[PDB]
Design a protein around this nucleic acid. Structure first.
Ligand SMILES: [Mg+2]
Ligand SMILES: [Zn+2]
Ligand SMILES: [Zn+2]
Lengths: 112, 104, 171, 383, 56, 55, 180, 79, 83
DNA sequence: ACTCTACCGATAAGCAGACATACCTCTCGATCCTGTGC
RNA sequence: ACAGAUCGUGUCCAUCGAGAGGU
DNA sequence: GCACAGGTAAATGGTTTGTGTCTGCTTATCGGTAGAGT
């Protein structure tokens, strides 16, 4: 019910300028904001305090605090996000990088 | 603008046309338009990285002098109209040059 | 001492060679690669047995260029000089520092400080060796030598030998 | 630990998988306790007690004052807690205790938070600023490291030659302050560090703190090559997907093309043209680098292009390039157009693409990016 | 889809005009709407400027 | 120093002193010079009231 | 080039339990219950001096036969043994193959069993005990006269084998090596 | 395109990282074709990675901050 | 972890997959890889890649990674191209 | 039955921490010395 | 025994603050 | 003849129009039962 109320509030917010936004975007936003059992604010005290990678988290808010926290702990960054791959300069597993391309010998000998 | 600033006592820059014989790490711009005093006479067309003021500073193998010339701007060109030479408060040399261009 | 292990090798193939003969190309690549290798982890690779069902997996293409990385699976005979292991070889060289042994393809050194003072360097005899009592040892003669440890893990692989042990020398 | 598994509340708290939440729960439950117990009643049969095995000494109220920790020992004594005794206590912590607290016995032990051996960055981290006229201007990090070394030497000499406890205390306080300012120059409740120039010193935390930092200004955002920017303009005669590139921009920007039997003649013609006309080339790349310049060597024409080389030709027609306007709010602000060389120094675009760009022709500035590989070119064209 | 949703929500926010006043119907209650309302919704403010309630 | 750097104060403690008090004269156009010679600034630093045109 | 993935905190184990020892303590790569490419839980294979020579010889002749058949489809004692593997190696492996000559020469010179039936029955005889295959290979390769030589040769057989059984299969191996 | 813009059209660096420590403190001598890690006397597992120079500078600064950003080329899961 | 009879992924070929395949084929052709189709006098590697994709003569395999870590292999010639 | 005082929970109210669209263009200054030396 | 003038390629002048700008 | 090296200055007292909106820590304040009688 809280998620539905939040979606209705957002839809009412984008109602006066005349702009129309597809339901999928706002639904995704409110689902992200209510993934846990309560409201998750879009700020340093909301979605930030999560279990995601430290490198991807520390690129928006203050950085050295979370770096010190990571050093004090021993959490592992899976490097499956976009920010980590951008920092490491590798092809992020998004869009064209969501799959792998391999060559097969059977098809290679099939054509010729 | 340029100045004949002095380091210590004997390390004083001088205004002269630099030569390949005793100048190291010098700029690759043309020095043909320069004169003996190190300044371009008014009425000479300049363009690109051409050197307008020739200044060299003593190093302290030879190469006792190192260039400090200021070239013209990469995107600017024109004809020099007025060159001003005078002295600053302490007594060194003060040199000012001007470039005139028409923008259609 | 001889072991056979299911080793793995990673190779990169240029796409200009992407023809029907890629399988045999990789086969000869592996063949000349692991033959005579001196890897410090596995040891000495002598022969590549089981030239069948190599099972060349699909070659992932690197995003940078058109090359493909292949992970070939194979088994081969390995040779590593395990420390503290008694082996038998033949004498090849004998300087004043000591007499070497020819256990396998290695150059195990029996330094003078290892075997007892009984062995003396007698240069009067035509083959320079360590002629002494308790049996005769010479160049190209049977000798059993123990291994103290492994050194120089990079580049060539060899060890150091000793004779000071009951029922170890002569034979 | 102050509390163990005997307590029901402690047992409930020691169940969270998250390290931060578990540590917070442990701290909240143990901050109330102020004395070792050594005799904890069992969960069953509360009449009989079980010897915990502690020391029985009371605990102080640790309070943070600047860069030092003070403890109000009340059974009130006010003794400043030295770093040595805290480190010794940390070294005596059992593995399970800080494993439950959140610390890892392999990667980050609790006792490693105390600085006993400070590494120095290499010269690449703190380069030398040449600066106009021959003067060796140095980075603030080098000056801070020299200050730390001087403080350490002074403390060592003062300890060795014999001195009152006040001198040792002030020397160690100065060393701690200098180290902290080297690592963080924005300490709350402490005076900032100033050099001879009078400006605040630059710390690595200040080096990476905002959008000019190493991460928000040099990792997710950086300057790039093979890009251009010039005033845009309208052209009704252009196609919907087409951008008017000035001849100078085309002659400056280059695209590396691998020589192939299908384009050997074209590449040879472009090389013979030289980096003067628009349909020309600027560089020729042979095997293992070894770049060849076509404007200084002048050896063009008598050079034969072998297979596998790379030629940096100028941007020609129908070349897919990226066209961008700032600010980039939606994905429509980034589009791929086809290069059309025009004889004027301005950007020309179709009038129908201005709406997604949200741009007009009153002095707007827009950026152009060119690809450098077949992967990027094809994906830009098809996506 | 997350980046697309974020852009599709943020673009009208920039494209909106002033949204500080004029949001009054029959009764001039000065109901908060527009950019400040969106900001307080995103921040999940515990004390909104103009709390309201509807009863049927 | 005060008339050159524009920081009204001594050489030290320039961070805590005001900035922009002294500015180089704008001589692009006579009207620009006249406007620059009759300019006032209120040091404020989020607030719409001080920026509004009062009666 | 590896066959085992990281386990038991291989990143920062910080134990450094030496590198090798005579009393078992084999290397991590040569550990018991190895991992096969398709199977699992397979023990390490240990080859004697005679077994290894037969294995390499059979692999070489198989490769030579395969190469000869491909070409066709496209179109004494110790002294005699040296010529055989010389002519086998001169065309099968190819390349420099300098290291292969010394290994084969050492295998031929120090070979203990030359009969296929005897080497085949060696494993059947030795399978009675549950000893680690490394030490059984050591006793099969190295010569012996009684229990004292076997006990002194390696330190991995302390009270692990009864003396009566030890002397029994030592004499068994003695006759099995003196018959050929 | 993002990877090309971030790496090829900008800073691009190659470093050697020890497979045990996970740090970039590896002594590499390309003339003699040998590598060594003095931290754990490792010589038979050295990997090379392509990262931007800014990332290398950030990692070096973090190491100067007594924080170890160990980098590994394999995924740690199960056992 | 490569099921075949339990492949629940869509049989169609996505836009990202099409772009990646076309780019890889074009790059390989540009760096002088063998071509399995006649060119009709064409000289641009990208259009040659499109021509090869038209008749499904590209010897490549798409490995679609499931979020858990499993994957299934789809051949290019068996993927339906409709966009 | 609730006095003589202890920990449980539940708030008020003061003390600090983080930060504010994106893109580029140009000019202009400053980066130490005074008490102390024979 | 042997046992050199420079030559030939040469890398840039940076940082910190302040102000004025324009989409 | 001129250079050479440490941070010895202010003590003070002192400052500035109009930055909110959460966040966490540290007290102060308010009910409520338990060690038992005439
Ligand atoms: Mg405009
Ligand atoms: Zn205690
Ligand atoms: Zn290491």
């Amino acid at each position: 019910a809280g998620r539905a109320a939040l979606y209705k509030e957002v839809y009412n917010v984008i109602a006066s300028d005349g702009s129309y936004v597809n339901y999928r975007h706002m639904a995704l936003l409110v689902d992200v904001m209510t993934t846990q059992g309560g409201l998750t604010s879009v700020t340093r005290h909301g979605f930030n305090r999560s279990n995601t990678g430290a490198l991807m988290r520390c690129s928006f808010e203050e950085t050295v605090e979370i770096l010190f926290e990571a050093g004090a702990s021993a959490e592992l960054d899976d490097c499956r996000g976009v920010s980590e791959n951008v920092i490491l300069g590798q092809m992020a597993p998004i869009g064209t990088g969501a799959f792998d391309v391999m060559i097969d010998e059977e098809s290679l000998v099939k054509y010729m | 603008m340029d100045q004949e600033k002095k380091y210590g006592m004997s390390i004083t820059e001088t205004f002269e046309k630099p030569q390949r014989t005793n100048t190291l790490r010098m700029k690759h711009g043309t020095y043909d338009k320069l004169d003996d005093d190190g300044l371009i006479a008014p009425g000479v067309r300049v363009s690109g990285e051409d050197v307008i003021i020739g200044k060299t500073t003593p190093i302290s193998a030879y190469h006792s002098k190192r260039d400090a010339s200021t070239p013209l701007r990469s995107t600017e060109n024109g004809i020099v109209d007025q060159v001003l030479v005078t002295t600053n408060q302490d007594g060194l040399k003060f040199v000012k040059v001007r470039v005139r261009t028409t923008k259609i | 001492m001889f072991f056979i292990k299911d080793l793995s090798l990673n190779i990169t193939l240029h796409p200009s060679f992407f023809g029907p003969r890629m399988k045999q190309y990789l086969k000869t690549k592996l063949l000349e690669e692991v033959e005579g290798s001196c890897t410090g982890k596995f040891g000495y690779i002598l022969c590549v047995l089981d030239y069948d069902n190599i099972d060349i997996q699909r070659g992932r293409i690197l995003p940078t260029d058109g090359s493909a990385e292949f992970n070939v699976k194979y088994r081969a005979v390995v040779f590593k000089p395990f420390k503290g292991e008694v082996v038998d070889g033949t004498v090849v060289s004998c300087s004043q520092h000591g007499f070497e042994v020819q256990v396998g393809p290695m150059k195990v050194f029996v330094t003078k400080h290892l075997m007892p003072q009984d062995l003396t360097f007698n240069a009067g005899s035509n083959p320079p060796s360590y002629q002494s009592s308790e049996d005769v040892i010479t160049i190209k003669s049977r000798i059993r030598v123990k291994i103290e440890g492994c050194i120089s893990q990079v580049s060539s692989i060899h060890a150091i030998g000793s004779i000071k042990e009951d029922y170890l020398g002569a034979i | 630990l102050l509390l163990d598994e005997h307590n029901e509340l402690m047992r409930q708290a020691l169940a969270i998988k998250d390290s931060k939440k578990r540590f917070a729960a442990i701290w909240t439950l143990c901050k109330t306790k102020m004395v070792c117990e050594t005799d904890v009643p069992s969960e069953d049969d509360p009449t009989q007690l079980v010897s915990r095995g502690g020391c029985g000494n009371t605990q102080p109220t640790i309070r943070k004052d600047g860069l030092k920790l003070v403890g109000s020992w009340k059974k009130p004594e006010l003794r400043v807690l030295s770093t040595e005794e805290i480190l010794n206590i940390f070294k005596h912590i059992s593995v399970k205790d800080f494993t439950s607290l959140g610390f890892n016995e392999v990667f980050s032990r609790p006792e490693w938070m105390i600085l006993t051996c400070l590494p120095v960055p290499p010269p690449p981290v703190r380069p030398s600023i040449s600066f106009n006229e021959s003067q060796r201007g140095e980075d603030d990090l080098t000056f801070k490291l020299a200050d730390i070394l001087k403080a350490n030497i002074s403390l060592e000499t003062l300890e060795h030659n014999g001195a009152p406890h006040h001198a040792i205390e002030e020397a160690e306080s100065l060393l701690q302050f200098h180290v902290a300012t080297y690592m963080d120059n924005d300490i709350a409740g402490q005076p900032q560090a100033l050099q001879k120039s009078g400006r605040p010193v630059k710390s690595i935390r200040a080096r990476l703190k905002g959008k000019e930092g190493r991460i928000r200004g040099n990792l997710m955002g950086k300057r790039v090559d093979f890009s251009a920017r010039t005033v845009i303009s309208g052209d009704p005669n252009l196609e919907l997907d087409q951008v008017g590139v000035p001849k100078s921009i085309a002659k400056t920007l280059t695209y590396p093309e691998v020589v192939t039997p299908y384009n050997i003649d074209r590449l040879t013609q472009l090389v013979r043209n030289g980096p003067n006309e628009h349909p020309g080339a600027k560089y020729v790349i042979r095997d293992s680098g070894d770049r060849i310049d076509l404007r200084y060597s002048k050896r063009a024409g008598d050079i034969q292009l072998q297979y596998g080389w790379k030629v940096e030709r100028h941007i020609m027609d129908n070349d897919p390039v990226l066209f961008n306007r700032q600010p980039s709010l939606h994905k429509m602000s980034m589009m791929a157009h086809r290069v059309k060389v025009i004889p004027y120094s301005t950007f020309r675009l179709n009038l129908s693409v201005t709406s997604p760009y949200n741009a007009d022709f009153d002095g707007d500035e827009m950026n152009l990016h060119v690809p450098q590989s077949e992967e990027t070119r094809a994906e830009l064209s098809q996506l | 889809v997350g980046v697309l949703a974020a852009q599709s929500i943020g673009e009208p926010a920039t494209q909106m005009t002033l949204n500080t006043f004029h949001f009054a119907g029959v009764a001039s209650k000065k109901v908060t709407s527009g950019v400040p309302r969106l900001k307080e919704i995103l921040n999940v403010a515990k004390n909104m400027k103009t709390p309201s309630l509807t009863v049927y | 120093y005060a008339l050159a750097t524009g920081n009204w104060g001594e050489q030290k403690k320039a961070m805590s002193s005001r900035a922009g008090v002294s500015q180089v004269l704008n001589r692009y156009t006579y009207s620009s010079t006249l406007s620059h010679l009759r300019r006032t600034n209120t040091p404020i630093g989020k607030l719409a009231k001080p920026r509004q045109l009062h009666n | 080039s590896t066959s085992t993935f990281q386990t038991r905190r291989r990143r920062l184990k910080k134990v450094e339990e030496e590198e090798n020892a005579a009393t078992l303590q084999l290397g991590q790569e040569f550990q018991l219950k190895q991992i096969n490419h398709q199977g699992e839980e397979e023990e390490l294979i240990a080859l004697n001096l005679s077994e290894a020579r037969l294995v390499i010889k059979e692999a070489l002749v198989e490769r030579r036969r395969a190469f000869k058949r491909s070409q066709k489809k496209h179109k004494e004692t110790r002294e005699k043994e040296l010529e055989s593997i010389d002519v086998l190696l001169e065309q099968t492996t190819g390349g420099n193959n300098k290291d292969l000559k010394n290994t084969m020469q050492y295998l031929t010179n120090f070979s203990r069993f030359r009969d296929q039936e005897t080497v085949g029955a060696v494993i059947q005889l030795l399978k009675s005990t549950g000893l680690h295959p490394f030490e059984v290979a050591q006793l099969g390769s190295l010569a012996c006269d009684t229990a004292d030589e076997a006990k002194t040769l390696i330190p991995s057989l302390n009270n692990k084998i009864s003396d009566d059984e030890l002397e029994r299969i030592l004499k068994e191996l003695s006759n099995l090596e003196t018959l050929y | 395109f993002l990877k090309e813009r971030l790496m090829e059209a900008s800073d691009a660096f190659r470093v050697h990282i020890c497979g045990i420590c996970g740090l970039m403190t590896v002594i590499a001598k390309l003339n003699h074709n040998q590598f060594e890690c003095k931290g754990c006397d490792n010589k038979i597992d050295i990997y090379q990675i392509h990262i931007p120079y800014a990332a290398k500078l950030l990692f070096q600064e973090l190491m100067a901050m007594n924080i170890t950003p160990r980098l590994y080329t394999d995924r740690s899961r199960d056992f | 972890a490569i099921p075949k009879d339990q492949r629940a992924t869509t049989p169609y070929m996505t836009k990202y997959e099409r772009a990646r395949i076309l780019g890889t084929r074009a790059l390989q052709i540009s760096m002088n890889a063998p071509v399995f189709v006649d060119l009709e006098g064409e000289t641009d590697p990208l259009r040659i890649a499109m021509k090869e994709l038209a008749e499904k003569k590209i010897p490549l395999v798409i490995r679609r990674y499931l979020p858990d870590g499993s994957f299934e292999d789809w051949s290019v010639e068996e993927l339906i191209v409709d966009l």
